[PDB]
Amino acid sequence: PPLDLRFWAKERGLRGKTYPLVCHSLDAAAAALVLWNEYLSPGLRDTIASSMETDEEHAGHCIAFWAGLHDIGKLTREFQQQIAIDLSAYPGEELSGEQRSHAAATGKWLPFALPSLGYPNGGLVTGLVAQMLGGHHGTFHPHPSFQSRNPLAEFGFSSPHWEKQRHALLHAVFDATGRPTPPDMLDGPTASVVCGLVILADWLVSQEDFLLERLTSLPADGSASALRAHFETSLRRIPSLLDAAGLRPITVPPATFTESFPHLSKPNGLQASLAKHLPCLCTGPGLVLITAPMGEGKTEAAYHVADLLGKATGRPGRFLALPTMATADQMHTRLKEYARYRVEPRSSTLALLHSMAWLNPDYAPAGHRDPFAATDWLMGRKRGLLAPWAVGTIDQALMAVLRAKHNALRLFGLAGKVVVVDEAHAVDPYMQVLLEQLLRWLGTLDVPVVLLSATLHHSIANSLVKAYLEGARGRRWNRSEPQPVSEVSYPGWLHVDARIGKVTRSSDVDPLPIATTPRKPLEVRLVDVPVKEGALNRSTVLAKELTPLVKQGGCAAIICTTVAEAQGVYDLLSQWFATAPDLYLLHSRFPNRQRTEITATIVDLFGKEGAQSGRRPTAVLVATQVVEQSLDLDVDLMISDLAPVSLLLQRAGRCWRHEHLGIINRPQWAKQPELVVLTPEQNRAPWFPRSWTSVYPLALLQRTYTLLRRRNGAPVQIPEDVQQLVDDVYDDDSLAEDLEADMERMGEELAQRGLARNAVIPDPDDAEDNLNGLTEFSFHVLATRFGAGSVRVLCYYVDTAGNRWLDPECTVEFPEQGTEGRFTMADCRDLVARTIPVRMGPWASQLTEDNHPPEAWRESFYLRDLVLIPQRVTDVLPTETGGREWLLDPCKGLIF
DNA sequence: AAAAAAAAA
Ligand SMILES: Nc1ncnc2c1ncn2[C@@H]1O[C@H](COP(=O)(O)OP(=O)(O)O)[C@@H](O)[C@H]1O
Ligand SMILES: [Fe+3]
Ligand SMILES: [Fe+3]
């Protein structure tokens, strides 16, 4: 029966016109084909065509054929009747009131029409193709279950008339795609990644511009003549669409390490070691774990190893995962220069992928595009990982393995990339489970991985590589099977072949250790300090300790476990200084603009471009664990509250950071690089402040103390002594005298891994014949990090009236509306820059309408969710809101 | 009581 064009697919935005369901259907199939040929990484084409066991060309047309059937579920009454249309020729199929999504209908119709063109009736390939297509709106569904010998009728397709028109369309796209035969195999994971492509296809050809243009040249009628024509047209128009979006590949020439970094005279031990023994190893899918100190060129080493594996795997894409928005920003710059130098583009964007990317001027847009420039299309919402190259927060990749809508899109996203995750030592137990499940899915999808780290506990390292190997190899780990990683070297690198699972430790090919920057050992000195009312009266020990610095000069940092304590020290220091030397305070609770300003002048004093510029003073910094995030600091003395060793040794890396540059003059009192470790005095298991034991688990603080004491003042040889300690704090059980504290720590840790497992998509082998796990969830949006999270507040000022102001000075009004009534992005940036990150608590509950944003604001993404904290000013008082009193000190940051 | 991230077709 010749097909009827009265059935539609798109109505909206077309101004009283309709686009025919076939014209969409063909477009989507046209789109997938081009995507298959010009977007998909070559290696990935291979991976997919492998799974179906057929040539790429055949696999190409299959997928295209499948893309054509995506919106077939629209050819029902429930859907068609949404707008005016004449169905007088189509009696039957009267509304059931199920109100079933067209996508759901596609998955329900396909398993029973498909075999009419050779697919195995009740067969897995058919089962998967239908399920996968039925999920083209970011939600899979269960396989159709039925109790009769006429499932088609059982599922509501009961009319000869209607059933004839679905079949017409089944055959129209079959034909236009040149009748491809059914593949013999198809696995869950492959199918998911294909679903992503199919989704990119539909989206691409759904843009209002592209539609309007096809509305001009609609087909005259439903002939194979007319439909063959329509397809082949859209076919030509699609590679355009790729450019507008910036989805064109960024392929990059092979190169040795020095061809790739010509500005580098003397590559270091790590880079030489990697560049030398790696290419021979890198012969396809694998993972590589570099674990090395800071100031060793891990970055260029990464790009290099990435560059090898990329070529080995037919995968020119890149995702770099960073721990923070900031470091993702910085790296996004570096990787872009790297791109410019390295490639001979301008239709390929190097995306930046985190939640504050819009509010960055130099990324976002405000034909002749600048190379690697962002594109409107890629600027949201679930699209980022579709950028050919991208760097972002690690949180962006972890979303792929969380059970949420459209995760198949992001899985597709990554499947052609070479993924690189920096700072793995940074990932807590909850996150580490998401990472393991991602690794497992990247493993099975033939995507190579580079992991970079500073010291890593062997257990984590093992767990991560095991995860990647599990994914690579099809089956999970035996109880009997030996562990893949029993020891880690710092410095060290390690390679893992997917194909045979062989692991090559760096030491295996070279008995010498990898040369790092030589450096003096670190004096670590434990110091008792009197408790006063369950707190730390540091008043004295600061005297004793800071005195040389006040006389002869230098630079030193005090790191306190909480922000409260952080502020009190700066106060206590301040009084003292009434009676050069400078004083600074850093932590989370500062307005953005202010934090970005402090940090800039803090690194400029204590960092490196200060020392080279001789701007480095003759000075104290107080901070919390912001110091553990990347800050170019070099202090002479460091004093920290006891924290876990890994975090102490982390912290301590700021001691004499740049001694290896000749250009530095340590004051005479500074005999050796030193970290002073404050711990309270006691009176049979070590006690610590409640304040401390709520941020770090109690036992671990014990185990660190216990372990530090055991050394008797001994310095820490760096890096010979480090990894040892990191391993040991968790491994040597004799280090925990409090079995109740050590057991809770374990329970708390089990609790974090547990929530995670609840939160992540299936193992690939659990998903082999069934994709529904990927999107299934019951009883809100799943998190990539454990905890009650954080909210952004913004302080406003009330005079004796009270009128709303944005400064204590009450000259800049509180903008109730914004510069066309609505807010420009630049308005938002102004507002957001004022804001402060504040951890969720009980206070969140007890809010009022005067803590909620005005009504204009609600219409702005970045603004709707701000909480407002009033500040009472008279001719600025602490102000109750939530249940406590908030004062935003300008020198000390937010207080409560 | 740290720090950290986090509308589509
Ligand atoms: N031989 C080298 N290998 C790698 N980086 C080098 C080398 N010589 C100089 N550099 C530069 O010195 C800086 C060292 O920083 P890097 O070690 O990558 O990170 P961090 O300094 O944060 O540990 C980088 O800018 C790198 O570009
Ligand atoms: Fe649809
Ligand atoms: Fe569609």
Short mmCIF file of C-alpha atoms (C1' of nucleotides) and ligand atoms in Angstrom, two decimals, chain A residues 9-10 24 28 70-71 74 102 136-137 202-203 205-206, chain B residues 9, ligand 3:
data_model
loop_
_atom_site.label_atom_id
_atom_site.label_comp_id
_atom_site.label_asym_id
_atom_site.label_seq_id
_atom_site.Cartn_x
_atom_site.Cartn_y
_atom_site.Cartn_z
CA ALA A 9 6.23 14.03 13.17
CA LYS A 10 6.77 17.67 13.94
CA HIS A 24 11.59 13.00 9.76
CA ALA A 28 17.14 10.69 11.12
CA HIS A 70 13.22 5.78 15.86
CA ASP A 71 9.93 7.78 15.85
CA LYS A 74 4.28 8.24 16.44
CA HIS A 102 5.55 7.39 21.19
CA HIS A 136 15.64 7.47 22.07
CA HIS A 137 14.37 9.97 24.63
CA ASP A 202 17.23 12.89 15.93
CA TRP A 203 18.49 16.03 17.72
CA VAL A 205 17.74 17.05 12.38
CA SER A 206 15.27 18.61 14.82
"C1'" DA B 9 14.22 17.45 19.98
FE FE C 3 12.37 12.16 16.35
#
